[PDB]
């Protein structure tokens, strides 16, 4: 045990790596956790809606109001989306305004100049560019804040309960490996909030890749 955190605020909540993530608060931690987001109550399933220790607050980013209150006393946000430059600059906005601190989102790996020449070309053939713009702007705007965030800059994703291993990979290193699972992520999340000494988080932007996955495009699942 001994997380370093007891009250956490999730947006992006419906996503399937925050869903991970809340399973795995709920079973492995005490924290106290608070879902934001649109029909929550349906989205997610209700082994983790029924549960006391989980609060639903209704809104979008759009609505400053209802975020301010979903973020008020969190100690920690996760941030499982970090897609658009104004919704990131809307939840800097609302956590500078309720005295948040500390946030933790999700990004995506190739933004940095990281991958190797064909990973990265496979990367961008499969994406829109909208897609990566919007990315790269809520990517730009955290750093510009003030925050105290972590980036977890993911490599492509899929879902295997048997793949649990990852590797961090630090700014400005090689970012080789071509897959992560979801649930080798959300060990990733849980042990930064387990971390007594936090620096190597501390306002930096960590790749987080599956060791021996150094191919041209993520495998065949």
């Given at each position: 045990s001994n997380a370093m955190y007891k009250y956490i605020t999730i947006l992006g909540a419906a996503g399937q790596i925050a869903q991970k993530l809340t399973a795995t608060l709920l079973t492995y931690t005490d924290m106290h956790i608070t879902l934001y987001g649109r029909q929550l109550k349906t989205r997610i399933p209700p082994e983790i809606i029924d549960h006391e220790r989980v609060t639903v607050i209704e809104g979008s980013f759009q609505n400053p109001g209802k975020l301010e209150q979903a973020v008020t006393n969190a100690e920690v946000v996760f941030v499982?989306?970090?897609?658009?430059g104004s919704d990131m600059a809307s939840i800097v906005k609302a956590l500078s305004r309720k005295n948040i601190r500390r946030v933790i989102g999700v990004s995506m790996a190739g933004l940095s100049g990281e991958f190797p020449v064909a990973l990265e070309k496979w990367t961008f053939d499969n994406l829109p560019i909208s897609y990566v713009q919007g990315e790269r702007q809520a990517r730009n705007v955290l750093r510009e804040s003030n925050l105290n965030y972590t980036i977890l800059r993911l490599t492509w994703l899929y879902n295997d309960p048997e793949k649990t291993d990852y590797e961090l990979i630090p700014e400005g290193?090689?970012?080789?490996?071509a897959q992560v699972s979801r649930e080798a992520v959300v060990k990733a999340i849980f042990d930064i909030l387990h971390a007594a000494d936090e620096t190597p988080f501390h306002r930096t932007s960590i790749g987080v890749g599956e060791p021996g996955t150094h191919y041209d495009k993520p495998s065949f699942h």
């Open positions: 499982g989306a970090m897609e658009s290193a090689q970012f080789n490996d």
